[PDB]
Ligand binder design. Structure first.
Ligand SMILES: [Ca+2]
Ligand SMILES: [Ca+2]
Length: 279
């Protein structure tokens, strides 16, 4: 399949070079996979989700996404126009309030919820979790992310937007999950993107157009935007049977565009998520 005039991030993950406009992907498009978006919620009614999104858990008064961040991330995972895995099933877990903030105890609970809730869903091609959140280092947050990964979920987490070593941030610093840095349309590390040995992969993160609340769209930047690119790619590859939840991050790194990025500090992987699609 080919989506013309796609968001640059989608085109980038289906190209060996930057500057393309078409997103080439296999028509399976993550069908049969499931991606839990652990964030501010998802505006499931957005036409861009085509009924494939639903809220499954909220830790606040409402399951409504009153912020937009979670809806944006979910859109990059699997919205029709802005998603990597355009046929995946999206499950919203609202651990962040409508200001985009959340207590670590609630974020931990949301991870534990997904690890259990997945056993009640039909996700034959596997389960992915996109965690476009994080704060300071927390062994308990890291352990929760490790538990979620160990339970059989492909966990993708944002590296953080501190332009610093992700070792000091969680769940970014959890080794067992897929820690995602951000790049821009010119194959530079996003000026805000965290770095360091714990990063597994980079994804498009600067000026990422996706869904937004109120049935709208907007372009925002962050490692929160690169993470769903990798989560959606994992779902896409798992549907293709090329990898599993336990190995998806290693597979994405193994098959990534290598050495394409600039402004990558020594010791940080120079790997950009790439779907290796061949028509
Ligand atoms: Ca290249
Ligand atoms: Ca890792």
């Amino acid at each position: 399949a080919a989506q013309t005039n796609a968001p640059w991030g989608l085109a980038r993950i289906s190209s060996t070079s930057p500057g393309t406009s078409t997103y080439y992907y296999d028509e399976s498009a993550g069908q049969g996979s499931c991606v839990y978006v652990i964030d501010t919620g998802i505006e499931a009614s957005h036409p861009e989700f085509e009924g494939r999104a639903q809220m499954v858990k909220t830790y606040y008064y409402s399951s409504r996404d009153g912020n937009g961040h979670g809806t944006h991330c979910a859109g990059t995972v699997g919205s029709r126009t802005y998603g990597v895995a355009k046929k995946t099933q999206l499950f919203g877990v609202k651990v962040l309030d409508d200001n985009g903030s959340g207590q670590y105890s609630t974020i931990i609970a949301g991870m534990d919820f997904v690890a259990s809730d997945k056993n009640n869903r039909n996700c034959p091609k596997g389960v992915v979790a996109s965690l476009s959140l994080g704060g300071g280092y927390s062994s308990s947050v890291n352990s929760a992310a490790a538990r979620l990964q160990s339970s059989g979920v492909m966990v993708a987490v944002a590296a953080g937007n501190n332009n610093a070593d992700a070792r000091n941030y969680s769940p970014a610093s959890e080794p067992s999950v897929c820690t995602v840095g951000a790049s821009d349309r010119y194959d530079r590390r996003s000026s805000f993107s965290n770095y360091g040995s714990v990063l597994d992969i980079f994804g498009p993160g600067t000026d990422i157009l996706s869904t937004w609340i109120g049935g709208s769209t907007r372009s925002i930047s962050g490692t929160s935007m690169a993470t769903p690119h990798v989560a959606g790619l994992a779902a896409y590859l798992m549907t293709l049977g090329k990898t599993t939840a336990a190995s998806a991050c290693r597979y994405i790194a193994d098959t990534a565009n290598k050495g394409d990025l600039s402004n990558i500090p020594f010791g940080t992987v120079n790997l950009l998520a790439y779907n290796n699609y061949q028509a």
